[PDB]
Amino acid sequence: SSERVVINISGLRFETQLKTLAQFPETLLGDPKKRMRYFDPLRNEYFFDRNRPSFDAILYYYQSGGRLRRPVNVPLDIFSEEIRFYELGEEAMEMFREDEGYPESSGPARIIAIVSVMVILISIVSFCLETLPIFRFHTYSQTDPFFIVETLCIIWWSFEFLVTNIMNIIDIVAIIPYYVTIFSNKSRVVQIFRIMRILRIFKLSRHSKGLQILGQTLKASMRELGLLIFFLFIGVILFSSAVYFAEADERDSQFPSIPDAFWWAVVSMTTVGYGDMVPTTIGGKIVGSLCAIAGVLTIALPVPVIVSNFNYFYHRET
C-alpha cells in the first residue's frame, strides 16, 4: 500500500508509507485498531501530544527495518518511555538496552554482613601479624593464637559456605588452602597454599561495590591490559639491551647482562626510580633518558581506555 500516512507529533509533521508501518503489525503505529484512536479526520493525520525529538528515531526504526538508536540529544529515560508508548515490543527493547549498556534484605539479615566484615577485616589483620619477627619438623612446618582466632572463623566461613559463581568462589578458596595442608608426612609444597590464604581479602568484594565495580572494569578491558603488558615487554627487552651494549665496556657497569637490566628497565619506564641500578656511562644515560620518556608514552596509551571503562561502570551502577 503506497497510501501515505501523516503523523503529527506536537506540531512536527512526519510522513511515511502505510506499508512501512505494516512491517511491525504488533506495534501501535502498525495496528489499525490501536492507532485508530489518535486519528484526526479533519486533517487526515494521526496526532500525538508527545516528545518531538524522540519520534525521528522511532520512524527510522520502521524505515531502516529495525534500527533503534536513541538520538544523542535525547535523554535515556525520555527515549525509553517513548519506545514504551509506541509499543515497539520486547525483543526491540532489549536490543536497545544492550546497545545502551542478600545482605541488605531488610536490616536483620543485613547486619549479618557486618559479622562477615570483621571476620575478614581482621582475618587479614591476623594473617599479617604471623610474618612478624616478634611472633616467630613440627615447628619447621608449623595450640597457638595465630591458629586460635583464625579457625575461630575458619569454620565460621564453611558455615555460610553451604547456607557455581565467582562471588561464591571467594569463600571456597577462602578456606580451601587451609584443610589442604591439614592432610601424611608425620616426619616446597603446601607453601603454594599459605600464600593463597591472602586471597581471603577478596571476600570483601561481597560488601564493596566500588571493588566489584573494578571487577568488571577489568574483564571489560582484558584487551587493554594485554596491550599494556605487551608494549612494556617490548620497551623493556628493547631498552635493557641498549643500556647493556652501552655499558658492556665498564669497570663499573651495573648490568651483568641484559636479563639483569630488565629490573632497571621496568623501574625506569614506570618512573619509580629506586636507584639500586643506574647507568654510569654517557651512552647509558642517553639510553636511560629515552627509557624514561618512552615509559610515559607506553603506559599512557592503553590506560586511558581502561580509565573510561571505570568512568562508565562507576556511574552506571550509581
Interaction residues for a copy of itself, span 206-235 (CB under 8 A):
208, 210-211, 214, 217, 223, 226-232, 234
Using CB under 8 A, pick the residue from 206, 212, 237, 250 that binds a copy of itself: 237
Cell, residue 47: 496526532
**Which residues from 152-181 bind a copy of itself, rule CB under 8 A?**
none
Residue 6 contact partner, candidates K ion, a copy of itself, none, CB within 5 to 8 A by sort of partner: a copy of itself
Buried b (16+ CB within 10 A) or exposed e, 141-163: eeeeeeeeebeebbeebbeeeee
Using CB under 8 A, pick the residue from 31, 34, 50, 206 that binds a copy of itself: 50
**Which residues from 261-280 bind a copy of itself, rule CB under 8 A?**
262-263, 266-268, 270-276, 278
Residue 8 contact partner, candidates K ion, a copy of itself, none, CB within 5 to 8 A by sort of partner: a copy of itself
Shortest distance, position 276 Cβ to K ion, whole Å: 8
Question: What residues form DSSP beta bridges with 48?
Answer: 9
**Terminal C-alpha separation, the chain:** 48
299 binds a copy of itself (CB under 8 A): yes
CA distance 178 to 175: 5
**Which residues from 253-292 bind K ion, rule CB under 5 A?**
271, 273, 275
**Which residues from 63-102 bind a copy of itself, rule CB under 8 A?**
63-64, 67, 69, 71-73, 75, 78
Beta strands 39-40 and 4-9: pairing type?
unpaired
Closer residue to a copy of itself (CB): 152 or 234: 234
Q: Is-contact 65 4, C-beta < 8 A? A: no
Beta strands 45-48 and 39-40: pairing type?
antiparallel
Length of the chain: 318
Shortest distance, position 222 Cβ to a copy of itself, whole Å: 12
Using CB under 8 A, pick the residue from 101, 107, 108, 256 that binds a copy of itself: 256
Residue 20 contact partner, candidates a copy of itself, K ion, none, CB within 5 to 8 A by sort of partner: a copy of itself
**Which residues from 126-145 bind a copy of itself, rule CB under 8 A?**
127-129, 131-133
**Which residues from 158-177 bind K ion, rule CB under 5 A?**
none
Residue 119 contact partner, candidates K ion, a copy of itself, none, CB within 5 to 8 A by sort of partner: none
Buried b (16+ CB within 10 A) or exposed e, 51-89: bebbbebbbebbeeeeebebeeebeeeebbebbeebbbe
Shortest distance, position 148 Cβ to a copy of itself, whole Å: 19
Closer residue to a copy of itself (CB): 56 or 105: 56
Place of cell 597457638: 144
102's enclosing H/E stretch is none
Task: Count CB atoms within 10 A of the CB of residue 301.
Answer: 13
* Closest CB to K ion: residue number: 273
Distances in whole angstroms, Cα of residue 97 to Cα of each of 81, 83, 101: 13, 11, 6
In the complex, the residues that contact K ion under the rule CB under 5 A are 271, 273, 275
